[PDB]
Design a protein around this ligand. Structure first.
Ligand code: HEM
Ligand code: 7PW
Length: 449
């Protein structure tokens, strides 16, 4: 009962050549040809693609012993660190590591995060001056490396970003990893090794400093508005009693910071580009902002939580340009999928990119149209019609933080600046792990009157 196959052009390499040109177009073309589920061989991996919202239950509902996240990347050279994330000894242990991070994402902390957004943009606004042009993707990456770093690690990290080039070494954690790195065998990567070592030494020092801060001010552990992911990694332990090492704490922090940064900076870029390019969307965004802000001058938590239309704009950006283009699981046993059984050892693939352009879900899906959500509720037609943050067990735990961070940053930029996008909104570039717009993305800005 095998799903239909994409015919191998060559043995072993299989469909890799057309997949490598464009992974999203590959899944779109082969969906049209072969239906809601199909298999391709790609450099010796059996890849089974699930393409229609009506059949995604069997992917998202599975237990870790049926469809395995850990198995997809457990033989990967650890980008984050040994024994953390997909290198952890178990899925249960990975979920304890996820909890160390999610512990830092409370309402009490979200209230402080808004203050941190205002502070970082106020520094940035001074650099930008009264008017100019700025790369949108670079602006958003540079803002969120400061905001995400402070929100998750606390304000002691800032000195290392301003003075010790934590930013530079962080940008290389990623180095040479494209969405095709998964299929090529293990190469060397000394640049990445130098990055992780460098970030590791900075994170070791933050841990050492925070231990001394705990001894001087233990009442910190009672303050939900101060407790960050560093505090949680120093205070929490594994269920099974095995030691949480500083090696683990550093890898989990790098992995937390990577998650908290790339996806937010890219989504922020797409959302602002599309908002400022559409007269009616910009009108309603600024009307919402004007209503929420009243005669107040700065954001707080309750204001951001009201910004429903700016939230739809970001979810519309997430529909059209999801920064994670494939969600993958390893079949540890045969998986039923409609009339088919997907074989043991196949990797199942769900693509937010393909989900976002599904005409069964969304009308005129190449048009940025936030009202498709607020008015027509197109995201609600299917349970799995919108999956930019995934679903089930491994759903993003960062969703509310990402919404808070991107909505705040865009609200505050619109408060300071009139902004115009230079040229055509580009296509996504499928050349990085977290995919964002084709590089040249410039906008004009001018201080508002
Ligand atoms: C717009 C920004 C974001 C997008 C689009 C996004 C997307 C996703 C998606 C699709 C998944 C599911 C992956 C899978 O099923 O295999 C996921 C998982 C995850 N995300 Fe995010 N994410 C975002 C922001 C964040 C942030 C800001 C954090 C942390 C501060 C975060 C932490 C995580 C974690 C820990 C998981 C794994 C949960 C688990 O394995 O059980 N994400 N994210
Ligand atoms: O970072 C990855 N996934 C992201 C996706 N993300 C972002 C925001 N929300 C979810 C991710 C993440 F960065 C961190 C976490 C996480 C964070 C903290 C924890 F405690 C536990 C998990 C989860 C995640 F899912 C990731 C990293 C490496 C790879 C990978 N794919 N191929 C290679 C590879 C490397 C080399 C050669 C050959 C291949 O590496 C794939 C995905």
């Amino acid at each position: 009962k095998l799903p239909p196959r994409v015919p191998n052009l060559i043995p072993y390499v299989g469909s890799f050549v057309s997949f490598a040109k464009n992974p999203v177009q590959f899944i779109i073309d082969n969906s049209k040809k072969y239906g809601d589920v199909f298999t391709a061989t790609i450099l010796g991996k059996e890849m089974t693609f699930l393409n229609h919202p009506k059949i995604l239950d069997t992917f998202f509902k599975a237990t870790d012993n049926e469809l395995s996240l850990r198995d997809v990347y457990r033989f990967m050279r650890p980008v984050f660190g040994t024994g953390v994330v997909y290198d952890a000894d178990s899925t249960e242990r990975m979920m304890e590591q996820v909890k160390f991070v999610s512990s830092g994402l409370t309402t009490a902390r979200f209230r402080v995060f808004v203050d941190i957004f205002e502070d970082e943009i106020a520094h940035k606004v001074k650099e930008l001056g009264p008017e100019g042009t700025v790369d949108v993707a670079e602006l958003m990456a540079d803002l969120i490396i400061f905001t995400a770093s402070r929100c998750l690690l606390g304000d002691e990290v800032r000195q290392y970003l301003s003075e010790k080039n934590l930013g530079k070494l962080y940008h290389d954690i990623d180095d040479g990893i494209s969405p095709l790195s998964f299929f090529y065998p293990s190469l060397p990567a000394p640049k990445r090794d130098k990055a992780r070592k460098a970030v590791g030494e900075i994170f070791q020092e933050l841990l050492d400093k925070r231990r001394e801060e705990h001894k001087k001010h233990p009442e910190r552990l009672l303050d939900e508005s101060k407790m960050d992911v560093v505090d949680h990694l120093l205070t929490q332990k594994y269920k099974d009693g095995q030691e949480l090492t500083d090696v683990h704490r550093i890898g989990i922090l790098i992995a937390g910071l990577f998650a908290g940064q790339h996806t937010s900076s890219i989504t922020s870029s797409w959302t602002l580009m599309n908002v400022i390019s559409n007269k009616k969307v910009l009108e309603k965004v600024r009307k919402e902002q004007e209503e929420i802000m009243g005669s107040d001058k700065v954001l707080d938590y309750d204001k951001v939580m009201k910004m429903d239309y700016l939230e739809a704009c970001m979810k519309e950006a997430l529909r059209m340009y999801p920064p994670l283009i494939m969600i993958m699981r390893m079949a540890r046993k045969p998986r039923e999928c409609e009339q088919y059984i997907i074989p043991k050892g196949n990797i199942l693939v769900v693509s937010p990119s393909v989900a976002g352009r599904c005409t069964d879900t969304y009308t005129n899906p190449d048009v940025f149209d936030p009202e498709r959500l607020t008015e027509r509720k197109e995201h609600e037609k299917f349970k799995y019609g919108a999956v930019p943050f995934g679903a089930g067990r491994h759903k993003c735990i960062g969703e509310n933080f990402a919404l808070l961070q991107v909505k705040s940053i865009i609200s505050i930029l619109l408060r300071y600046f009139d902004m115009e996008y230079i040229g055509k909104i580009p296509d996504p570039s499928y050349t990085s792990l977290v995919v964002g717009p084709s590089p040249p993305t410039r906008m004009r800005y001018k201080l508002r009157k």
